[PDB]
Curated annotation (Swiss-Prot):
Coiled coil: none
Annotated consequence of substituting residue 31 to A: In strain: Mu/B.1.621
Shown residues in whole-protein numbering: 1025 to 1191 of 7096
Entry superkingdom: Viruses
Organism in which the protein naturally occurs: Severe acute respiratory syndrome coronavirus 2 (2019-nCoV)
Catalysed reactions, semicolon-separated: Thiol-dependent hydrolysis of ester, thioester, amide, peptide and isopeptide bonds formed by the C-terminal Gly of ubiquitin (a 76-residue protein attached to proteins as an intracellular targeting signal)
Role this protein plays: Responsible for the cleavages located at the N-terminus of the replicase polyprotein. Participates together with nsp4 in the assembly of virally-induced cytoplasmic double-membrane vesicles necessary for viral replication. Antagonizes innate immune induction of type I interferon by blocking the phosphorylation, dimerization and subsequent nuclear translocation of host IRF3. Also prevents host NF-kappa-B signaling. In addition, PL-PRO possesses a deubiquitinating/deISGylating activity and processes both 'Lys-48'- and 'Lys-63'-linked polyubiquitin chains from cellular substrates.
Subunit structure: May form homohexamers. Interacts with N protein.
Protein name from the UniProt record: Papain-like protease nsp3
Topology relative to the membrane: Multi-pass membrane protein
Effect seen on changing residue 164 to L: In strain: Gamma/P.1
Subcellular location as annotated: Host endoplasmic reticulum membrane
Domain called Macro: residue spans: 1-167
Activity regulation details: Inhibited in vitro by GRL-0617.
Amino acid sequence: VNSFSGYLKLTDNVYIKNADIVEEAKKVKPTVVVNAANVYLKHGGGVAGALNKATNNAMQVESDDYIATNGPLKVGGSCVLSGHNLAKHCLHVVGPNVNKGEDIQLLKSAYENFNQHEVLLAPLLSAGIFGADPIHSLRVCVDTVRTNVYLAVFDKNLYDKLVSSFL
Ligand SMILES: C[C@H](SCC(=O)O)C(=O)N1CCNC1=O
């Protein structure tokens, strides 16, 4: 049994809800919240901007030290950092950004990072300002992630479209 409430069950392991990921993280304090990161961990907008703002910029400070030591992530890659006030840990995952011309086949590699964690609160990777089709992102999620993933869809209109179109 876990703390997550009000989710629709899509599959054995994937759940979805119309929710503000910061507000959901603040309520649940999950072991892992996933950030929609870029390779530079520059948390300017979308999920990264929101999450970072909710940490009062502590996520960005920690991220800048990580990059100064380790250099950029790979597209499709991830790192584990603090969850600050939102979660125990934040898994920063880099999905391909279609608005930068990155290969969408890298979306499956991105979701494979979730399999290193038994339970996660996450957004749909590569959706929103990353330019990919959220319907596609949900399909790749379901077909890739085997651990228990609780997806927070920001937009109610999009949430309803994702549920109604789910095969
Ligand atoms: C990846 C999403 S796109 C819209 C969606 O999930 O419907 C995004 O930009 N944001 C901002 C805050 N929470 C989010 O998920």
